[PDB]
């Protein structure tokens, strides 16, 4: 079984980030190396101020250990990192690897603004991290921050997509992930001919934690199994829609918990056969 490094935050309570990546990627037939970039009592939306461990001095030791133990990784998914130093540490470790797949979710902001504690220093560190990525999955706010364009609710995909590509290696893909078209929500990217493609599914009411994390985990898992980008995005969006639908069907009293994974895990097992 292939090995997938996943580096992102772990919140003990919340059902998002590394806690949701582990079940998904394990079900998708990877041996997951689950590396917290931060450790939190709960995620940061709705439980009050969480108790957090700073892992900035641990990760360097982790990479040094794996290096000496002669561990090698097939594929990697990098999610929320959270500090300039950790971005830089991850960037150089990954450069030491021969990765067949690197997916970066360049978590930086939403609704037109940087997340709290993130400033243009973090933006620069992210631009360095994405340099070897095969695929990046910014939202519309993150795309604008990376290129340095002023935020637009509806940027010109014909302008912003080439601008983003200009920072990636030849053959890599910038996929913008929360693009709305009429009643749809989905992903937009440039095909090999340079034409903007859109892949979406009918938007469901409400807002749900962990959707981007699970989308990234599914995209990484599919690409890692050799599925071309377009059918990968088609399936990820279908799966993304199905998980949100199951979440709604649970009639939850607690709106903080991340998207349900049961129907998604069932779909994965069916794909495996």
Ligand X SMILES: Nc1ncnc2c1ncn2[C@@H]1O[C@H](COP(=O)(O)OP(=O)(O)O)[C@@H](O)[C@H]1O
Catalog residues that contact Mg ion under the rule CB under 5 A: 139, 212
Q: Rule CB under 6 A: which of 215-234 touch ligand X?
A: 215
Q: Stretches 53-61, 64-72, 111-119, 200-208: which one binds ligand X (CB under 6 A)? A: 200-208
Q: What residues contact 32, with CB distance under 8 A and at least 6 apart?
A: 3, 4, 6, 21, 22, 25, 26
Q: Which of 244, 260, 264, 268 binds ligand X (CB under 6 A)?
A: 244
Q: Which of 79, 82, 186, 221 binds ligand X (CB under 6 A)?
A: 186
Q: Rounded to whole angstroms, how far apart are CA atoms 85 and 90? A: 9
Residue 97 or 145 having the CB closest to Mg ion: 145
Q: Which of 17, 237, 247, 257 binds ligand X (CB under 6 A)?
A: 237
Choosing among Mg ion, ligand X, none, which partner's interface includes residue 185 (Cβ < 5 to 8 Å by kind)? ligand X
Residue with tokens 């939202």, as numbered in its chain:
139
Q: How near is the Cβ of 171 to ligand X at its closest, in Å?
A: 23
Q: How near is the Cβ of 63 to ligand X at its closest, in Å?
A: 27
Choosing among Mg ion, ligand X, none, which partner's interface includes residue 146 (Cβ < 5 to 8 Å by kind)? none
Q: How near is the Cβ of 181 to Mg ion at its closest, in Å?
A: 18
Q: Stretches 58-66, 75-83, 183-191, 218-226: which one binds ligand X (CB under 6 A)? A: 183-191
Burial track 131-161 (b if 16+ CB lie within 10 A, e otherwise): ebbbbbbbbbbbbbbbbeeeeeeebebeebb
Residue 219 or 260 having the CB closest to Mg ion: 219
Residue 66 or 208 having the CB closest to ligand X: 208
How many residues contact ligand X, by CB under 6 A? 17
Q: How near is the Cβ of 174 to ligand X at its closest, in Å?
A: 14
Q: Nearest 10 degrees: CA dihedral of 59, 60, 62, 67? A: 140
Give me the residues that bind ligand X (CB under 6 A), please. 139, 177-178, 185-187, 203-204, 206, 208, 211-212, 215, 237, 240-241, 244
């Amino acid at each position: 079984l292939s090995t997938m490094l996943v580096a992102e935050d772990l919140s003990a309570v919340g059902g998002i980030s590394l806690s949701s990546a582990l079940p998904v990627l394990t079900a998708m037939q990877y041996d997951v190396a689950a590396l917290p970039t931060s450790l939190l009592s709960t995620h940061t939306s709705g439980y009050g101020t969480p108790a957090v461990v700073d892992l900035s001095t641990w990760l360097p030791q982790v990479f040094a250990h794996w290096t000496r133990a002669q561990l090698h990784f097939d594929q990697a998914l990098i999610g929320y990192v959270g500090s300039v130093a950790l971005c830089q540490q991850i960037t150089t470790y990954l450069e030491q690897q021969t990765l067949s797949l690197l997916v970066v979710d360049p978590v930086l902001g939403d609704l037109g603004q940087l997340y709290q504690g993130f400033d243009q220093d973090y933006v620069a560190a992210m631009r360095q991290l994405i340099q070897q990525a095969d695929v990046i999955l910014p939202n519309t706010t993150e795309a604008a921050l990376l290129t340095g364009a002023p935020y637009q609710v509806t940027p010109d995909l014909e302008v912003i997509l080439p601008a983003l590509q200009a920072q990636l290696k030849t053959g890599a893909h910038a996929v913008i992930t929360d693009v709305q078209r009429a009643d749809q929500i989905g992903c937009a990217w440039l095909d090999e001919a340079g034409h903007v493609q859109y892949c979406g599914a009918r938007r469901l009411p409400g807002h749900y934690n962990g959707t981007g994390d699970t989308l990234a985990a599914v995209i990484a898992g599919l690409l890692g199994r050799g599925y071309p980008l377009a059918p990968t995005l088609a399936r990820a969006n279908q799966w993304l829609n199905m998980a949100v639908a199951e979440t709604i069907a649970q009639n939850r009293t607690d709106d903080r918990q991340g998207v349900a994974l049961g129907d998604l895990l069932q779909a994965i097992l069916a794909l495996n056969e």
